[PDB]
Amino acid sequence: PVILSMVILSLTFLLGLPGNGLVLWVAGLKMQRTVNTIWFLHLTLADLLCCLSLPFSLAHLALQPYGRFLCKLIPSIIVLNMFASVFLLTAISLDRCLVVFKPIWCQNHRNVGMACSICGCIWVVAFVMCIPVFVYTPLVAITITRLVVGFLLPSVIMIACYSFIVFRMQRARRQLADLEDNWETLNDNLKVIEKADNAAQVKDALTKMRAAALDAQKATSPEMKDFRHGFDILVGQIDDALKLANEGKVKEAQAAAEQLKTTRNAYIQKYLERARSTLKSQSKTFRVAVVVVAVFLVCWTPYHIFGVLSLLTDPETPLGKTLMSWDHVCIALASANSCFNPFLYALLGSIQGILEAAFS
């Protein structure tokens, strides 16, 4: 099945250089450097460095043609890019979970300088794990070390961080839904009261409005202060209308209830818009990260599976022949991950709108 590996690798290169170059150039010399975009820039740079080495592997597979370098360094680029990508992805997930975490580690030193320092640290940490591959049974230990460091622990970290993030996103949702329900009963009762004659239905509608307003003010920092002050004014106005309707005046209660609309729009509408806006975006920002992580892991799993199988299985076996036959396909797919990654940005994203907005 060597021809299948050949064709898939050639297709990966043919569609890998253009996309990587386009994304790198658009994200690099268009907008300003921020703590968020820098990580994706580093990830795409590592993927581009990985993609640059494909023709050497193609020549090695096709000819099996000068020097030791064919068997010396170009096999190490896969390990290097895998490790750098894993560490950068776990750093992105850690930061995404940190944003919603305690503010003590949010405003301490969160700056572009810290971002590039941590990126350099990540590159160095990925580098110190590259030496064992290049230099030099060892196969017993090095395969286990790569699997444990590159696959298990970071995947656990991303799973925990994203489970906490989705649990926190599932919570606020309901809270908003409750506030929207209270808003809807307030609005429809205020619509009922205008067309309702008699002094009894006015009191019945105002009782419901008062309960809804109290519940809405209960649901939840000058922002909060202003939000609660608006509802205090709302409840006071409801009381004015209630005490007008109690003494058998209908039109005055109608006007008093009409006065509620001004305060409602002036106070609570802006908070409603902010709550709806913030919840919607964070959804997409988390969506892209989760999809990227899932694609990365599903691309890299066959390689680890075949490594474990080769380590466990004794040689001089036809099953060994099958596994070394399919090793080319496994490595080819692992490398095709690099070409796959840039396309999901446009899938889940004017060039600026489809690329730059995808990170923020």
Author numbering: 22 to 85, 89 to 160, 331 to 365, 1001 to 1049, 1060 to 1118, 370 to 439, 449 to 459
Copied sentences from the primary study:
Anaphylatoxins C3a and C5a, generated during complement activation, exert their pro-inflammatory and chemotactic effects by activating their respective G protein-coupled receptors (GPCRs), C3aR and C5aR1. These receptors are expressed on various immune cells, including monocytes, basophils, eosinophils and mast cells. Here, we report the cryo-electron microscopy (cryo-EM) structures of C3aR in three distinct conformational states: apo, intermediate, and fully active. Structural comparison of C3aR in the apo, intermediate, and fully active states provides novel insights into the conformational landscape and activation mechanism of C3aR and defines a molecular basis explaining its high basal activity.
Thus, we changed our approach and determined the structure of the ligand-free and G protein-free apo state of C3aR, to capture its inactive conformation. Given that C3aR exhibits high basal activity, and forms a complex with the G protein in the absence of an agonist, we engineered a C3aR-BRIL construct, in which ICL3 was replaced with the thermostabilized apocytochrome b562 protein (BRIL) to stabilize the receptor in an inactive conformation. Then, C3aR-BRIL was purified in complex with anti-BRIL Fab and an anti-Fab nanobody. The structure of this complex was determined using cryo-EM at a local resolution of 3.6 Å in the transmembrane domain (TMD). In both the apo and intermediate states, H8 adopts a reversed orientation toward the cytoplasmic center of the TMD, a feature previously observed in antagonist-bound inactive structures of C5aR1. Notably, in these inactive conformations, helix 8 (H8) of C3aR is oriented toward the cytoplasmic center of the transmembrane domain (TMD) in a reverse orientation compared with conventional H8 positioning in GPCRs. This unique H8 conformation is stabilized by a hydrophobic interaction network involving residues on H8 and TMs 1, 2, and 7. However, in C3aR, at these positions, R1203.50 and Q3726.30 are present, which do not interact with each other, as observed in our apo structure.
